[PDB]
């Protein structure tokens, strides 16, 4: 963890761990 490869569910869960209950504005390579 902390510095690693991350994809799909693992990247979504890492974003929820980093951002907390506020979540993320990102969408998985959809326009962003």
């Amino acid at each position: 963890f902390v510095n690693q490869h991350l994809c799909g569910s693992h990247l979504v869960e890492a974003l929820y761990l980093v951002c907390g209950e506020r979540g993320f504005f990102y969408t998985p390579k959809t326009k962003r």
């Binding site: 902390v2 510095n3 690693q4 490869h5 991350l6 994809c7 799909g8 990247l11 890492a14 974003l15 980093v18 951002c19 506020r22 979540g23 993320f24 504005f25 990102y26 969408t27 998985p28 390579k29 959809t30 326009k31 962003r32």
Partner: peptide, 21 residues
């Protein structure tokens, strides 16, 4: 989008913070 970094190369919490609400 950060999937095109994290999924094939390395990324980190400081780079995930850039996408937080």
């Amino acid at each position: 989008g950060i999937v095109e970094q994290c999924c094939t190369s390395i990324c980190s919490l400081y780079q995930l913070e850039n996408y937080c609400n």
